[PDB]
Design a protein around this ligand. Structure first.
Ligand SMILES: [Mg+2]
Ligand SMILES: [Mg+2]
Ligand SMILES: [Mg+2]
Ligand SMILES: [Mg+2]
Ligand SMILES: [Mg+2]
Ligand SMILES: [Mg+2]
Ligand SMILES: [Mg+2]
Ligand SMILES: [Mg+2]
Ligand SMILES: [Mg+2]
Ligand SMILES: [Mg+2]
Ligand SMILES: [Mg+2]
Ligand SMILES: [Mg+2]
Ligand SMILES: [Mg+2]
Ligand SMILES: [Mg+2]
Ligand SMILES: [Mg+2]
Ligand SMILES: [Mg+2]
Ligand SMILES: [Mg+2]
Ligand SMILES: [Mg+2]
Ligand SMILES: [Mg+2]
Ligand SMILES: [Mg+2]
Ligand SMILES: [Mg+2]
Ligand SMILES: [Mg+2]
Ligand SMILES: [Mg+2]
Ligand SMILES: [Mg+2]
Ligand SMILES: [Mg+2]
Ligand SMILES: [Mg+2]
Ligand SMILES: [Mg+2]
Ligand SMILES: [Mg+2]
Ligand SMILES: [Mg+2]
Ligand SMILES: [Mg+2]
Ligand SMILES: [Mg+2]
Ligand SMILES: [Mg+2]
Ligand SMILES: [Mg+2]
Ligand SMILES: [Mg+2]
Ligand SMILES: [Mg+2]
Ligand SMILES: [Mg+2]
Ligand SMILES: [Mg+2]
Ligand SMILES: [Mg+2]
Ligand SMILES: [Mg+2]
Ligand SMILES: [Mg+2]
Ligand SMILES: [Mg+2]
Ligand SMILES: [Mg+2]
Ligand SMILES: [Mg+2]
Ligand SMILES: [Mg+2]
Ligand SMILES: [Mg+2]
Ligand SMILES: [Mg+2]
Ligand SMILES: [Mg+2]
Ligand SMILES: [Mg+2]
Ligand SMILES: [Mg+2]
Ligand SMILES: [Mg+2]
Ligand SMILES: [Mg+2]
Ligand SMILES: [Mg+2]
Ligand SMILES: [Zn+2]
Lengths: 345, 452
């Protein structure tokens, strides 16, 4: 039906059935996650397989079958045969290293478990970064990505619990997202804070003048290198765009984009231009020596805009010689049979 | 070209060596199409929400409600087989809830009841919990009445201070007498002069005792796992060695997913050789266009054509009438044209660029086809999806996204059929959906005939 309530219910129901106890459960899972790490590395050490590989095979066996490996990541790990080979060597690990295998999996579980339990934490957080320009679900989701990040670095040896730790790792993820996706025309985090500062400042300035600050105040109040050109620029980027399609005038049926003309397209007038221009330019190009005329014709009209580097073997003296003598005989006979004079442009 | 290696007409049909650009003006930039590769499919709202759900009709599912049920949220439809019962056999095409679905895959009943104090229920439960099969309604005896009303075996968890006996290796290293030397026997204090058995009652924490540092004095559960616990399984090689050996060899998978006999999950407790074997079996459970994509591929329309032919002329008017309407869609599909596995979407065609302009206005204002805000929607969701799968994947969040994703895929196609997307606070206006483009108050075929 309507999307927010369902997920809210969705995880709030699962937290409702499994919140994590303050110390015990978070301690428990934490301990298992770390042991998993220490396990997977020791597995890498004895199998010579990359910890990345050991991590994905334990994931498959605990999180999902061939289905989850084939659709998500296209196909480099054979759906069946590949992962399985890897599990076999894991079995072969005698009593000593088999232990790590068994631990890795259970640890992997804990992870996902701890991650589940602290989803209320995200939503509570993500709740306040609401009106920034991101969808609540989008916001919770990035924040979610943030909590997963926290899970990778938390050291349970250092007594502090996951609560205060997740907060940071989540707030970071959110703010980033807000600054990275909120606008159509991307704007790095600095410009963002810049804009918040600009706004905030404009607020303190609205406080007493009764005059929406000329861009003079904003410069001053902002600080060190702020000037009028800077503020007019920043608020010009701050304006989000407009719907190219917006209801216009009497919104009966007016869509904004019919009124913008087109520039690359040669309006008839131009197509006609290019025809005579090319036909007459082509007539002159022939009745001439195919030497310094083509040099300057190709150097100017075929590639890019070098007198010396313009002519093949013959040096500068013959270039200027024929360039300026042919260019003028060409212009002065074109002065006679006036065809070009009427500036095609 | 973009860089300018080739710049006129002589070589009009060739592409640039270091950068790819074949040319004739920017019209190519407004006619070309790009596509997005979707993580986990979603479906066209144009085929799912038309009065006759062309997929609900073809796929005999609740034409209008079963769809909405599994599509947008988590209501699973058992796709191929699922041996374990609800009370009745595997529902070939029927749908179930998270709750009951949950009760399945992990094991029948989950009961975690953890005791209030340290000595009253912690003792009632412990005495009967470790090796004793606790029958249904096992009346644990102390706070109120700890009621375990379900199946097979039990697993208790922590223990503070009352008396320590028969528990796991945690406390072993604490009082060094048993883990340092063989002194657990003398640990029984004074009557020894006239497996675990500790002092009369000396430790009260879930700690490590270098110096009482790595601790956690808290609670103690008694979570009853309804699963069958095997201690000494043996070797019979008819089918591949199932379960485990005495103590040496352990062929079972670790403690997540392992199918041995009709029972299908296997947890492992290396404490005592205990191979926890849960009973629920491989039950293909899916939700979303994933599930429907499957269902759709599997159908041999010829069969349902013939099946409906008989259903059509033979039974009475109620089910035969339904079959006549359902025969229509299947007939054309087969007749001439294209086959029905395509209604599911996994590759979103993107409209040209110059058709979704980005333009400079006044002062520096810009103007872009509303379509682009919708595309970003999808792209971001599709990306975030990928990264969510890769980072690691907590179910709730993956679906949550998959949901947004779906909704998004609707948005560009057709906005408003299910809720209406909005540009941020400024105009509560339906971003023109491709659909809105074709039809619309003043759309395409429409104004294609109003005038030019
Ligand atoms: Mg409905
Ligand atoms: Mg190493
Ligand atoms: Mg080696
Ligand atoms: Mg190597
Ligand atoms: Mg398998
Ligand atoms: Mg590929
Ligand atoms: Mg699990
Ligand atoms: Mg947004
Ligand atoms: Mg809002
Ligand atoms: Mg976004
Ligand atoms: Mg700064
Ligand atoms: Mg602010
Ligand atoms: Mg002044
Ligand atoms: Mg902004
Ligand atoms: Mg209109
Ligand atoms: Mg000439
Ligand atoms: Mg000549
Ligand atoms: Mg010549
Ligand atoms: Mg000549
Ligand atoms: Mg040249
Ligand atoms: Mg050059
Ligand atoms: Mg030069
Ligand atoms: Mg040279
Ligand atoms: Mg010279
Ligand atoms: Mg003339
Ligand atoms: Mg080359
Ligand atoms: Mg080439
Ligand atoms: Mg190169
Ligand atoms: Mg109707
Ligand atoms: Mg019943
Ligand atoms: Mg029965
Ligand atoms: Mg207890
Ligand atoms: Mg006893
Ligand atoms: Mg005890
Ligand atoms: Mg003895
Ligand atoms: Mg004696
Ligand atoms: Mg004696
Ligand atoms: Mg004593
Ligand atoms: Mg004590
Ligand atoms: Mg303990
Ligand atoms: Mg210490
Ligand atoms: Mg406590
Ligand atoms: Mg025998
Ligand atoms: Mg065999
Ligand atoms: Mg069939
Ligand atoms: Mg047939
Ligand atoms: Mg019916
Ligand atoms: Mg303009
Ligand atoms: Mg948006
Ligand atoms: Mg992964
Ligand atoms: Mg918007
Ligand atoms: Mg509409
Ligand atoms: Zn180039």
């Amino acid at each position: 039906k309507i999307s927010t309530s369902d997920p809210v219910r969705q995880y709030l129901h699962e937290i409702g059935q499994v919140p994590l106890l303050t110390l015990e459960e978070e301690v428990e899972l934490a301990r298992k996650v770390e042991e998993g790490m220490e396990a997977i590395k020791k597995l890498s050490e004895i199998t010579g397989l990359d910890p990345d590989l050991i991590r994905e095979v334990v994931r498959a066996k605990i999180l999902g079958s061939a289905r989850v490996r084939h659709i998500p990541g296209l196909k480099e790990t054979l759906d069946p045969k590949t992962v399985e080979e890897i599990d076999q060597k894991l079995k072969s690990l005698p009593k000593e290293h088999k232990r790590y295998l068994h631990i890795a999996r259970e640890g992997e579980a804990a992870r996902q478990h701890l991650i589940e339990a602290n989803l209320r934490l995200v939503v509570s957080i993500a709740k306040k970064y609401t009106g920034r320009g991101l969808s609540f679900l989008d916001l919770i989701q990035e924040g979610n990505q943030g909590l997963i990040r926290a899970v990778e670095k938390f050291e349970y040896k250092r007594r502090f619990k996951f609560s205060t730790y997740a907060t940071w790792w989540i707030r970071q993820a959110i703010n980033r997202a807000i600054a990275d996706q909120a606008r159509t025309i991307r704007i790095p985090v600095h410009m963002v804070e810049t804009i918040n500062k600009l706004s905030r400042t404009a607020r303190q300035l609205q406080q007493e003048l009764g005059r929406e600050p000329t861009y003079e105040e904003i410069a001053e109040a902002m600080g060190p290198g702020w000037d009028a050109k800077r503020v007019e620029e920043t608020l010009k980027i701050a304006q989000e765009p407009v719907s190219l399609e917006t209801p216009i005038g009497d919104e009966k049926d007016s869509f904004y984009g019919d009124f913008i003309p087109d520039e690359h397209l040669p309006s008839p007038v131009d197509a006609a231009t290019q025809s005579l221009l090319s036909e007459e330019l082509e007539k002159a190009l022939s009745k001439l020596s195919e030497r310094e005329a083509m040099v300057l014709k190709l150097r100017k009209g075929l590639i890019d805009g070098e007198e010396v580097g313009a002519f093949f073997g013959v040096t500068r003296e013959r270039i200027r010689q024929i360039e300026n003598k042919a260019l003028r005989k060409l212009k002065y006979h074109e002065s006679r049979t006036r065809k070009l004079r009427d500036f095609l442009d | 070209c973009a860089c300018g290696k080739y710049k006129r007409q002589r070589f009009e049909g060739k592409v640039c060596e270091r950068c790819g650009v074949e040319v004739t003006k920017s019209i190519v930039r407004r006619y070309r199409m790009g596509h997005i590769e979707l993580a986990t499919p979603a479906a066209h709202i144009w085929f799912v929400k038309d009065v006759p759900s062309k997929i609900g009709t073809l796929l005999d599912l609740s034409a209008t409600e079963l769809e909405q049920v599994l599509y947008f949220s988590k209501y699973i439809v058992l796709d191929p087989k699922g041996a374990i019962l609800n009370g009745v056999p595997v529902e070939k095409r029927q749908l179930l809830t998270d709750e009951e679905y949950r009760e399945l895959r992990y094991g029948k009943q989950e009961t975690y009841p953890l005791p209030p104090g340290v000595d009253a229920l912690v003792k009632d439960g412990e005495e009967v919990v470790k090796g004793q099969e606790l029958a249904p309604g096992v009346v644990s005896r102390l706070d109120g009445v700890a009621l375990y009303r379900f199946p097979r075996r039990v697993r208790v968890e922590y223990v503070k201070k009352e008396r320590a006996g028969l528990r796991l290796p945690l406390a072993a290293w604490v009082e060094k007498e048993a883990y340092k030397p063989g002194e657990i026997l003398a640990e029984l204090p004074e009557p020894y002069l006239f497996g675990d058995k500790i002092v009369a009652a000396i430790d009260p924490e879930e700690e490590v005792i270098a110096e009482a540092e790595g601790v956690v004095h808290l609670h103690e559960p008694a979570s009853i796992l309804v699963v069958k616990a095997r201690v000494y399984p043996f070797e019979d090689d008819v089918e591949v060695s199932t379960g485990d050996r005495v103590a040496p060899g352990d062929v079972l998978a670790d403690g997540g997913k392992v199918k041995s006999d009709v029972y299908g999950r296997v947890e492992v407790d290396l404490v005592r050789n205990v191979v926890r074997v849960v009973e629920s079996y491989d039950i293909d459970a899916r939700m979303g266009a994933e599930a429907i994509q499957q269902l759709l591929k599997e159908l041999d329309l010829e069969a349902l054509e013939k099946e409906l032919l008989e259903e059509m002329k033979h039974p009475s008017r109620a089910r035969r009438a339904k079959a006549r309407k359902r025969l229509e869609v299947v007939r054309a599909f087969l007749d001439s044209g294209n086959r029905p596995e395509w209604m599911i979407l996994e590759a979103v065609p993107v409209l040209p660029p110059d058709l979704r302009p980005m333009v400079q206005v006044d002062g520096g204002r810009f103007a872009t086809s509303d379509l682009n805000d919708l595309y970003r929607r999808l792209i971001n969701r599709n990306n975030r999806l990928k990264k969510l799968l890769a980072q690691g994947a907590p179910e709730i969040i993956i679906r949550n996204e998959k949901r947004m994703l779906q909704e998004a895929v609707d948005a560009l196609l057709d906005n408003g059929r299910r809720g209406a997307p909005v540009t941020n606070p400024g105009s509560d206006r339906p971003l023109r959906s491709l659909t809105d483009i074709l039809s619309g108050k003043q759309g395409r075929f429409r104004q294609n005939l109003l005038g030019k």
